[PDB]
Design a protein around this ligand. Structure first.
Ligand SMILES: Nc1ncnc2c1ncn2[C@@H]1O[C@H](COP(=O)(O)OP(=O)(O)NP(=O)(O)O)[C@@H](O)[C@H]1O
Ligand SMILES: Nc1ncnc2c1ncn2[C@@H]1O[C@H](COP(=O)(O)OP(=O)(O)NP(=O)(O)O)[C@@H](O)[C@H]1O
Ligand SMILES: [Br-]
Ligand SMILES: [Br-]
Ligand SMILES: [Br-]
Ligand SMILES: [Br-]
Ligand SMILES: [Br-]
Ligand SMILES: [Br-]
Ligand SMILES: [Br-]
Ligand SMILES: [Br-]
Ligand SMILES: [Br-]
Ligand SMILES: [Mg+2]
Ligand SMILES: [Mg+2]
Lengths: 416, 416
């Protein structure tokens, strides 16, 4: 694809060796541009990471936690430095010339501070972040920071080292995920916490949307995985068909926990006729069989493993064959899982949707959400006709004042 | 694709739980059928192997050496059992219910005997091969057995435990790789050591073949990698263009040797305008961009890494982007390499062609070759007009008498 002028400016800064933060609304092509950046660089000395396993998958990277190799990051700095000096971990720190981080908004400032300090200590380079070229992107108006500790987290930009570490800031301002300017304008009002009467009426009108197709119902977006598991298990149980089982094969079952964070499929996949499923690997972009595609199980092959036949929203029916995930864990340890690329999809967490495009979703937005969380949910949908919002109330839409102040300081001095 | 009656009979035997050896000429779909078998089985308890790294890649498996975890296999049986009892190796032995082995002809009888004894000792199951369902294929009239020792190797069928371990034998007899019955008939005469006057005249006539296309020359097949390296290096040096470098990124540089056995690309790929290259990953079966495809470097992109533009024999010109190989080493350890899927291809070893289809080849066959080695070289070509044989003489075509006796015993009692 033709990069926009804005995307080309970011790639030019990266190839000049500039540390950069680039930002933009949901669906502006940040993660796409990271893939193009990675393609444009030598793989030696280039580390691709994201804040979360879900986001790391999108760019073929690892988690920032796995790269860093400092445990949780909560131990004292001396303990974290000793962990980073372990065989494998240390060579990763020493060999890293360029560190890509997607979905920065989930990285708390105290962790950024720890990583900056470990980088200097392991590399014995007394410069910001040990001299590593940082290539960071995300949207601070999307999912907020998380912490392995118990204190209220600070946004990454609050780190006293942030601006020294990413001195260049560029923006991507053209939304590609949604094609419809009416929906783009609605989403921007939500992102900024500006729900006019018109915006609220337009979101409430979606309560009547018939988002599915024959036999395909909406995926409910939920704030917590407990509620997702409960819903998917109950809806599967209620189907009359016999259960069909597909067991995953893992290279390292003792590290299942580490592999699950980054892999979107389960050790045990159970299906029935009528099961609502999400495809979680690109199979055929031309046929619309893409990551996030929704369908319904319409049959099982008679032969062999009895693989499922899935009809998708686009109208294509396909037998779904095995696939594989390889996850980079601590040091450079690699883990694999072989499984069908399907998950049950009556429900899905907002966190697990991070960075995805979806097209058949429902969400209840009648209570207080975390800063950015309602915006992330709404901005997954490719079009309004694939979105059903129940009980919408701008109480759900919250923007942390720290983030609005941050973006005002970013804007200061710019033409627009 | 519709399996033949013969292929379906092998898959039926496998799904009944029968240990089996299935055999056939070059290009009869043995490795294809193994992929279909693997697709029809649960991945848990199913181990995909081949005798060589080259052959393991074709089926997405590991080497038999890597799975077994007994070192070279030359140590005493007690030391081999202790090696197989290591953490990770032992669980692979205990968890294995079905063991697939492609290209069995390279497995010497003494190693088969050691593996059968290790299987019983580690699993504490006093039945052939520890009770593992064996799914074995190959062609004993192809590449002969190799040994990590210094004694003349025995063919795998000479093992005293061979027939007890694979009690069922089935054949695939329809060649698919070549479509031309003239060429199929010539190849069968070579396989059986039956070079009539007419067979030798037809092979000698190919000395005049123009096998290339504009700017594309034949890959010379060589018996030894020393001669391949020398030829590819000298031909690259002689080109006038500046050198372009592409350095691989390996998860584990300390196990490069382990990764190279299975990976068809180098740590350092050097290219020039005019370089003769082989694509070594499927990119587009649709457009003829398949494993083994030959082309010529016609340009380098101006942007980013300066990726190569390659024109292939089929007429397609494509920019060649990074790819990745993941290799399963001992005890479930996974290794990766990121590199462009190109190798220099003025020359290639016969051993590295094992199990491949090629389209643009030359071979000098005026020397004594190993049993099956001339047949393997000749049977890589999809068609005769992609093959140039220099100095052909039947002295090059040898069939080990042990193998002809084995196949006579296999045939005994059959209808045909
Ligand atoms: N230059 C471009 N022209 C057209 N489509 C583009 C371009 N760049 C990106 N896209 C498309 O934009 C869509 C969204 O890209 P993506 O990389 O997910 O954006 P993002 O900013 O990372 N989204 P999010 O993670 O939700 O904030 C993808 O389907 C791309 O195919
Ligand atoms: N049933 C089939 N119908 C048509 N083509 C087939 C069929 N089975 C296999 N093929 C084709 O046969 C070709 C050769 O298959 P392959 O699996 O390489 O054979 P092989 O017996 O393993 N060859 P070799 O390893 O050289 O002895 C492939 O291109 C397949 O596409
Ligand atoms: Br410049
Ligand atoms: Br609001
Ligand atoms: Br609906
Ligand atoms: Br979820
Ligand atoms: Br609600
Ligand atoms: Br001993
Ligand atoms: Br002969
Ligand atoms: Br010569
Ligand atoms: Br010769
Ligand atoms: Mg993204
Ligand atoms: Mg084969």
């Amino acid at each position: 694809m033709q990069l926009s002028e804005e995307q080309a400016a970011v790639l030019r800064a990266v190839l000049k060796g500039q540390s950069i933060f680039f930002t933009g609304s949901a669906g502006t092509g940040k993660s796409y541009l990271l893939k193009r950046i990675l393609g444009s660089l030598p793989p030696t000395g280039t580390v691709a990471t994201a804040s979360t396993g879900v986001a790391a998958c999108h760019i073929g990277g690892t988690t920032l936690h796995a790269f860093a190799g400092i445990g949780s990051g909560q131990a004292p700095l001396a303990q974290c430095v000793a962990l980073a000096q372990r065989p494998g971990v240390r060579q990763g720190w020493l060999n890293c010339q360029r560190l890509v981080i997607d979905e920065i908004s989930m990285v708390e400032a105290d962790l950024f501070d720890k990583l900056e300090a470990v980088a200097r200590a392991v590399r014995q380079q007394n410069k910001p972040f040990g001299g590593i070229q940082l290539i960071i992107c995300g949207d601070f108006l999307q999912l907020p920071p998380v912490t392995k500790g118990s204190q209220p987290p600070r946004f990454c930009f609050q780190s006293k080292s942030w601006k020294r570490c990413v001195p260049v800031t560029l923006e991507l301002t053209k939304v590609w995920r949604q094609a419809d300017q009416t929906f783009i304008s609605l989403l921007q009002a939500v992102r900024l916490g500006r729900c006019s009467d018109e915006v609220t009426r337009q979101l409430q009108a979606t309560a009547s949307h018939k988002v599915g197709r024959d036999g395909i119902v909406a995926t409910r977006l939920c704030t917590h995985q407990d509620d997702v598991a409960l819903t998917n298990e109950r809806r599967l149980q209620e189907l009359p068909g016999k259960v069909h089982r597909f067991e995953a094969m893992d290279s390292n079952p003792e590290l299942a926990s580490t592999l699950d964070a980054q892999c979107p499929v389960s050790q045990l996949l159970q299906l029935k006729l009528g099961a609502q499923v999400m495809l979680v690997k690109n199979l055929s972009v031309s046929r619309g069989l893409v990551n996030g595609a929704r369908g319904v199980v319409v049959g099982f092959e008679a032969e062999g493993r009895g693989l499922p036949q899935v009809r998708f929203l686009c109208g294509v029916t396909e037998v779904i064959h095995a696939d594989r995930w390889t996850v980079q864990a601590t040091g450079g340890q690699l883990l694999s899982r072989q499984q069908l690329p399907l998950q049950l999809a009556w429900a899905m967490s907002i966190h697990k949707s991070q960075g995805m495009t979806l097209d058949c979703v429902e969400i209840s937005l009648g209570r207080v959400f975390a800063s950015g969380q309602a915006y992330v949910a709404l901005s997954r949908a490719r079009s309004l006709q694939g979105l059903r919002v129940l009980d919408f109330d701008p109480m759900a839409v919250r923007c942390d004042p720290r983030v609005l102040h941050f973006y005002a300081t970013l804007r200061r001095g710019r033409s627009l």
